[PDB]
Amino acid sequence: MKSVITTVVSAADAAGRFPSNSDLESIQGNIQRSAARLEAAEKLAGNHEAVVKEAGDACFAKYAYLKNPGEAGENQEKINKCYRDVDHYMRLVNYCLVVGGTGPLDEWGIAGAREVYRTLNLPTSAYVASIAYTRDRLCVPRDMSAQAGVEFSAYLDYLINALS
Amino acid sequence: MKSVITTVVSAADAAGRFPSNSDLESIQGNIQRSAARLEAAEKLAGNHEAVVKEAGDACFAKYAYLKNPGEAGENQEKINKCYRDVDHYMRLVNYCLVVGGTGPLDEWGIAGAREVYRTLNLPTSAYVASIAYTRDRLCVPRDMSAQAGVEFSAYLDYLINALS
Amino acid sequence: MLDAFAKVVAQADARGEFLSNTQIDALSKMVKEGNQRLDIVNKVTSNASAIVTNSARALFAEQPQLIQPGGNAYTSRRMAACLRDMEIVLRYVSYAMIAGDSSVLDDRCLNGLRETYQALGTPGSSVAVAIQKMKDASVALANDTTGTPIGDCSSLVAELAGYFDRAAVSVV
Amino acid sequence: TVDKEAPRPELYNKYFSADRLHKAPEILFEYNKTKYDRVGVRYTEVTSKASERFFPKSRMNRAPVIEISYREGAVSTASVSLSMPEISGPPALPFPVPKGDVTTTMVTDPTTGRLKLEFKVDGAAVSAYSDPRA
Amino acid sequence: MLDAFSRVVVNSDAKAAYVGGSDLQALKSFIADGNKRLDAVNSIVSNASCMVSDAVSGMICENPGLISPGGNCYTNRRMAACLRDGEIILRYVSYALLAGDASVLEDRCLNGLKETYIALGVPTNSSIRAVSIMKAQAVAFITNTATERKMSFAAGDCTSLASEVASYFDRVGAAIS
Amino acid sequence: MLDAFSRVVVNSDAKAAYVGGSDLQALKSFIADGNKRLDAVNSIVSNASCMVSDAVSGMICENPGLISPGGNCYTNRRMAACLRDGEIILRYVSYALLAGDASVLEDRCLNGLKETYIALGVPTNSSIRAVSIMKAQAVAFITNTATERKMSFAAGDCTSLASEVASYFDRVGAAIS
Amino acid sequence: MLDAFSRVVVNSDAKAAYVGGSDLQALKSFIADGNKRLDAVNSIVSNASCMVSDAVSGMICENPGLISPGGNCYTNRRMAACLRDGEIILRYVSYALLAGDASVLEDRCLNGLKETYIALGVPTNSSIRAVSIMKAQAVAFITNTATERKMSFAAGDCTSLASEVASYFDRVGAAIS
Amino acid sequence: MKTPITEAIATADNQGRFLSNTELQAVNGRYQRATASLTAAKALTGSAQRLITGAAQAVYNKFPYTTQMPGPAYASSAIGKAKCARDIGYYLRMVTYCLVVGGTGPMDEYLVAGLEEINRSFDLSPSWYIEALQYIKNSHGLSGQVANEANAYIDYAINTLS
Ligand SMILES: C=CC1=C(C)[C@@H](Cc2[nH]c(/C=C3N=C(/C=C4\NC(=O)[C@H](C)[C@H]4CC)C(C)=C\3CCC(=O)O)c(CCC(=O)O)c2C)NC1=O
Ligand SMILES: C=CC1=C(C)[C@@H](Cc2[nH]c(/C=C3N=C(/C=C4\NC(=O)[C@H](C)[C@H]4CC)C(C)=C\3CCC(=O)O)c(CCC(=O)O)c2C)NC1=O
Ligand SMILES: C=CC1=C(C)[C@@H](Cc2[nH]c(/C=C3N=C(/C=C4\NC(=O)[C@H](C)[C@H]4CC)C(C)=C\3CCC(=O)O)c(CCC(=O)O)c2C)NC1=O
Ligand SMILES: C=CC1=C(C)[C@@H](Cc2[nH]c(/C=C3N=C(/C=C4\NC(=O)[C@H](C)[C@H]4CC)C(C)=C\3CCC(=O)O)c(CCC(=O)O)c2C)NC1=O
Ligand SMILES: C=CC1=C(C)[C@@H](Cc2[nH]c(/C=C3N=C(/C=C4\NC(=O)[C@H](C)[C@H]4CC)C(C)=C\3CCC(=O)O)c(CCC(=O)O)c2C)NC1=O
Ligand SMILES: C=CC1=C(C)[C@@H](Cc2[nH]c(/C=C3N=C(/C=C4\NC(=O)[C@H](C)[C@H]4CC)C(C)=C\3CCC(=O)O)c(CCC(=O)O)c2C)NC1=O
Ligand SMILES: C=CC1=C(C)[C@@H](Cc2[nH]c(/C=C3N=C(/C=C4\NC(=O)[C@H](C)[C@H]4CC)C(C)=C\3CCC(=O)O)c(CCC(=O)O)c2C)NC1=O
Ligand SMILES: C=CC1=C(C)[C@@H](Cc2[nH]c(/C=C3N=C(/C=C4\NC(=O)[C@H](C)[C@H]4CC)C(C)=C\3CCC(=O)O)c(CCC(=O)O)c2C)NC1=O
Ligand SMILES: C=CC1=C(C)[C@@H](Cc2[nH]c(/C=C3N=C(/C=C4\NC(=O)[C@H](C)[C@H]4CC)C(C)=C\3CCC(=O)O)c(CCC(=O)O)c2C)NC1=O
Ligand SMILES: C=CC1=C(C)[C@@H](Cc2[nH]c(/C=C3N=C(/C=C4\NC(=O)[C@H](C)[C@H]4CC)C(C)=C\3CCC(=O)O)c(CCC(=O)O)c2C)NC1=O
Ligand SMILES: C=CC1=C(C)[C@@H](Cc2[nH]c(/C=C3N=C(/C=C4\NC(=O)[C@H](C)[C@H]4CC)C(C)=C\3CCC(=O)O)c(CCC(=O)O)c2C)NC1=O
Ligand SMILES: C=CC1=C(C)[C@@H](Cc2[nH]c(/C=C3N=C(/C=C4\NC(=O)[C@H](C)[C@H]4CC)C(C)=C\3CCC(=O)O)c(CCC(=O)O)c2C)NC1=O
Ligand SMILES: C=CC1=C(C)[C@@H](Cc2[nH]c(/C=C3N=C(/C=C4\NC(=O)[C@H](C)[C@H]4CC)C(C)=C\3CCC(=O)O)c(CCC(=O)O)c2C)NC1=O
């Protein structure tokens, strides 16, 4: 992981420094955001039954080739276990939205994914359109507010720009 | 130089990563800090020609033995070195108030300091006997603002832990 | 050398195509300001020895360690070569004022200027503070309302600052 | 460029001179609510064309263009814009041209490009005459 | 500089000249309601091309024998001359709005205007009909009461300068009466 | 916020304007089938430059007398003026598609164009042939039934908007007949 | 590495002064415009996979002699490296704009990449055609005038900021030159 | 590439001089032939499509052998004509580029520099090439001083091959 609170005390530990004023300054800007940042995850949790009911099958709605004989989304032990794995990705950003950092993505999911999914007979392009439909569905005042939505978008695209 | 910006990108160069969403609320931590920070810096420049005297005579109001023969403050061209050397310490304070870190202190004034004070027979605690008089002289709404006095006194805590 | 008209020639010669019509009405905006370019270069080079010697004099006042013996600009050989380079930047900035781009200033004068100074040992932070005197002595010279009629030339004085700060960040 | 057609018998010269003919003060305005707002007048020759009963010189060739940015399912960043500039047409029609004669063209945004056409096929410097003699 | 406004005109020569920002307030203190009056010209000259086209076509579509073969708005050199003729009387009434008097409009435009039109055969009953549409436009643009284009202005009344231009258009119609 | 659109088209000058995300929802709600209509104007103006280049060259391909010496597609300024007359009507019919009416089409573009063309020597039946290709080219782009190009769209029909431009292109051909 | 806040300190150091109110006036206006720059660089790094897509697949269609057998991007390691060599140099200018100073770009990469590249054999004119293809790719994103993806910002004018990332990328290309 | 601005600069630099009132007047005349040269190369792109192969047919109807000769260096078959929508379009491109800068800049280094080596060792004799743009100089559709400024750099390109 790396949040804002550990990344100052890790470079203070590699030189053995005391917590300086710049270390005292780096914590303050989380408080200006986490009034609006910690209330985006609670809308993300109560709607979590219906967003992957909308976007998790949208990448099956663009792709009927995922259900062929010898595929990943073909039958009920692997269709419903697709919804096993995709609601972890809703859960992973719910753990990134509360820490203020990019921590639990590459703690748990982003870490070495190109040698996971090059074995499992999985394209990475199926993983694209599930969150690519999720991100452009954001209109501003209903799921978000103005200053809340400036960084929930930044957690939508951070997994997009990592694995691709 | 140690600042509030040098921790952000030298970690991100060691991470091999972009500036994420995590890296920029030290910069929101910067601008909430930097409004009432720099009011302390220009207020020091409107007084400092007396302040390095009025804290500078206090170490001669504490340790009168320096004016003896054979000592460091024995004559007038050596006493104006002692006001040269104390103005250059308080010239690095307002540099340290601009950058928001401690880097100008820890390269030009602290790094290599205590190896030359021994060899030139200068007392390592008469300097911190002087800027201790800089620390109690604050009455916080009058000289500073109500929050800016603590963020100025926190750099007086750094340099008396550098010589002691 | 290249001026602003020579930009979009070479910005379309490797592209291959002809000059498109949506670019050149911005370039025929530039000839409306062609008469407010040539007064302004005439404002700089008429006072071209009063911006140099008034800012070298205010450089050695604040920094007495350059004219002290053993300093960099001590002798009469190295004083004349300090006033030489203070006027050289005043030429190549005003060359970039009349042309419309930076690309004669940072190709004939700033391409290795700080690495000239690291080899010779001159303080490269201190040539920037002489240039920023000459920035303030010329931007405030090119806002007089004598000699020209009045009117808003606020767009063209930011270009004169923008090459004076380009020599302020070239030499450090 | 000399359409002497005003029949024009010389019976207008005692009331309107030749130098002071079809010349009127045109007033200019740099009115942008700014400190450099100038008013000016200038006194030039007045010309007109016969088309301007219905298409005057301010409304001459000004048609409302539409630019639409739209990715698929991206209505939160999709936008419409509207302007009417002095709109010029596309580049000109070519020669009649015979059994082909490498039909020309031009396309794209940055620059005009332009290729070479052999009626559909676009040869354009591949050097088909490649015959060394060993 | 009101004389140097006139010295664009009276030396019969094509130049360009302006008035700067410090030179504006000398004219604005001198000319009463100059913030209204510079708005009054700028309401006209921003639509000076459209003012002549509704004026000449309302003269055409009410008097349809003018575009006949034999009519005086045939033979497209003669049509373009009539569109030029409505422009010069629009700029001279706009400069009369700026200068505040019609005394530069009377000698430069209206003097000799009467018998120079029967010199060429202009139907002057159509010409009084042509300038009356421009009288209806200029009271719509200055009062911001045009039926299709409203413009942004400072809030207030402009009924004196509406009547002054409508006085100044009547000197054009009485010159060809 | 169509008043904000109509004030762009009434000011008779060059002025850029654009719509943010809130007012686009006011655009999509005020105009019916706005998900369909804004697709239909985008399918034309993405390929509007090839539509004017094909159709008047198809007018050359059926009427070859226009590029004769003495024809009206000779003297390449006049050839480009036919291309300039090609591009204005496509921007005007797309705004007539977008507003849902032809009331902006009649006054700004179709008023007096027949009298303009017979005074300029323009062969108006040749332009009827050029604009009938435009009625076929706009329908094949709205229905996405073009032979050489196929753009991605949402599923469904657009035959109301495919028939609406045939109402709009016949208004141009009735205006110049 | 230099900061712009550090830039006024060494300005005030060989001068041996304190910090006055005079040079302080640049930096206090830099604070309130800090959020506008903070609204810029988040969209530079989040569309970076597209900017390294069009870095190398765009430069190879305008010189395809490197995918030829014998070229300098022929094998699938040099195909892999050219995808990798461009995604570090826009990572460095994302660091460089937050400090504001180009010296962090100079000491880390722009001191000596030119001397490697003629011993690594790659051509520099191919590189600056691939440098400048990210230049206009960058300046669309800061202004929100990009075509296929339009992102969330506020409303204003960052053309002082949009020249600054164009003030970096020419010196990216001039370093290889 | 020698812009008339850039030799006011380069003949103020080899003497080591500030930009005096001598070279300030030469860039004023570049601002005086600005508008009368910028309508030329704008509208020459507006009528460019006729001028490429309408000038090519003014060579084959002058020279019938160029379609009839057996050789690689002619427009006889269908591959030589595709070079002939390219190799005389370069002459039409740089005459637009000279009217941007107001001087004879881009064709002095891109076109004319080292040209007899290209001509003699391909046998591409310029008796076609002079008549390739001789159709352009009289059928451009331009009048006034816009004609004479557009015809100013055409016959500089004539005399460099003649
Ligand atoms: C956790 C984050 C989160 C979101 C982003 C939304 C996404 C979302 N929107 C809707 C459902 C809806 N969403 C919108 C609003 C919008 N739809 C769009 O396509 C526009 C871009 C946007 C603003 C105009 C509307 C109008 C509906 C009802 C009609 C519909 O189904 O689209 C639904 C179905 C259930 C519901 O009503 O909530 C979902 C999951 N909901 C969430 O829980
Ligand atoms: C860049 C930042 C910077 C500094 C922090 C100072 C630090 C400093 N002080 C002194 C040097 C000195 N400093 C003192 C100062 C003191 N002795 C006393 O009796 C008091 C305790 C105290 C003053 C209150 C004296 C007396 C000398 C002279 C040493 C000598 O006589 O040999 C020197 C040696 C060179 C010299 O003599 O000037 C240096 C480097 N100078 C700098 O340039
Ligand atoms: C830049 C920072 C800065 C400061 C820290 C003070 C430091 C300082 N104090 C005084 C002068 C004074 N300063 C104080 C202030 C105080 N005395 C106390 O006992 C309290 C601790 C404190 C707040 C009540 C008082 C009461 C005087 C008058 C004389 C004295 O007692 O020193 C003076 C002389 C000129 C003046 O009055 O301004 C200076 C420079 N001033 C500054 O400009
Ligand atoms: C050979 C040398 C040479 C020059 C330097 C220029 C000088 C010059 N400037 C102006 C004319 C002018 N010049 C200015 C310029 C300025 N006003 C300011 O407040 C700024 C300080 C300054 C810009 C640097 C303005 C505002 C005008 C009047 C507006 C206008 O040009 O239309 C005129 C009158 C003709 C005209 O209006 O264009 C001339 C000859 N021309 C030359 O031939
Ligand atoms: C100094 C001020 C000044 C003017 C006011 C006009 C006045 C004016 N108008 C025309 C000339 C003309 N004026 C008109 C105008 C009209 N005829 C009509 O039927 C309509 C009523 C009306 C237009 C709406 C026409 C049609 C001609 C040309 C007549 C012809 O050439 O046969 C001439 C030509 C004779 C000559 O050139 O000497 C002059 C001086 N021109 C000026 O220089
Ligand atoms: C706002 C309203 C508006 C329009 C509808 C267009 C229409 C338009 N076209 C031309 C002008 C022209 N229009 C054409 C067009 C054509 N001739 C043909 O033989 C083809 C059939 C057709 C092209 C396909 C030509 C050739 C000219 C040139 C005549 C000239 O330049 O004098 C003119 C100028 C006529 C004049 O000066 O009076 C106008 C107003 N432009 C506008 O501003
Ligand atoms: C076919 C027959 C035919 C007509 C009967 C006239 C139509 C016409 N329009 C106006 C009247 C007007 N005409 C305009 C002019 C314009 N309005 C704008 O929004 C544009 C900016 C500008 C060019 C169109 C204005 C501002 C008025 C006054 C407002 C009004 O009453 O309509 C008048 C004078 C008022 C009156 O009715 O007495 C007439 C007669 N034009 C014709 O062609
Ligand atoms: C440089 C060019 C230049 C101009 C174009 C004018 C423009 C102008 N007019 C007014 C100000 C005004 N303008 C008008 C005019 C009008 N209001 C109406 O309701 C009518 C539509 C219209 C009549 C024509 C009025 C009534 C005022 C307020 C009174 C006044 O200041 O004159 C103001 C001051 C506005 C303010 O700050 O509140 C300005 C800048 N002045 C200039 O210096
Ligand atoms: C901001 C700009 C903007 C646009 C460009 C449109 C674009 C647009 N149209 C539709 C949605 C649609 N779009 C079309 C249109 C078409 N389908 C076809 O097969 C025809 C080729 C074409 C007509 C020309 C239809 C028929 C629908 C579904 C019904 C509807 O929503 O109107 C959708 C939603 C797609 C979905 O449900 O996933 C979008 C984004 N709307 C906008 O807000
Ligand atoms: C030499 C003589 C010559 C012609 C007679 C015409 C040939 C021509 N093409 C189209 C018809 C068309 N032309 C286009 C235009 C285009 N298609 C695209 O994919 C591009 C985007 C764009 C420029 C090429 C379209 C979309 C159609 C309708 C679909 C089709 O028939 O192709 C039509 C109208 C349909 C009809 O009534 O037949 C005609 C007459 N072009 C010529 O050159
Ligand atoms: C040679 C083969 C070839 C390609 C590989 C593509 C690639 C490509 N894209 C652009 C041009 C561009 N490319 C982008 C990049 C993107 N747009 C977005 O919004 C996405 C988030 C992002 C990833 C795709 C942008 C923003 C522009 C500028 C155009 C614009 O959108 O305004 C350019 C022009 C830049 C230049 O050369 O100067 C090229 C060559 N086009 C081609 O002709
Ligand atoms: C600061 C950023 C930064 C870099 C750029 C690289 C610098 C760099 N690039 C390459 C190496 C390379 N870089 C490229 C890329 C390119 N060559 C071209 O012809 C194109 C112009 C361009 C793509 C846009 C290629 C093709 C190689 C060759 C790999 C090889 O030789 O095996 C190597 C050799 C790697 C090795 O030997 O292991 C190094 C050190 N490192 C860094 O830290
Ligand atoms: C948590 C992550 C995080 C961010 C994403 C930024 C978010 C951010 N952006 C702006 C605010 C802004 N950002 C822009 C920038 C732009 N507008 C444009 O028209 C251009 C497209 C673009 C770049 C030129 C402008 C013009 C403002 C308003 C001015 C301002 O108050 O800063 C503001 C200040 C006002 C507000 O509270 O909204 C903030 C906090 N800061 C953060 O802490």
Ligand SMILES: CCC1=C(C)/C(=C/C2=NC(=C\c3[nH]c(/C=C4\NC(=O)[C@H](C)[C@H]4CC)c(C)c3CCC(=O)O)/C(CCC(=O)O)=C2C)NC1=O
């Ligand atoms: C073509 C344009 C051009 C540039 C860009 C240039 C840079 C340049 N500056 C030089 C020297 C110098 N430059 C300086 C100037 C300074 N040092 C300081 O400490 C001051 C801060 C500053 C003066 C204000 C000095 C003192 C020398 C050394 C002269 C010598 O050693 O002889 C030298 C060594 C040769 C010499 O002039 O003696 C070069 C090449 N020379 C050029 O001809």
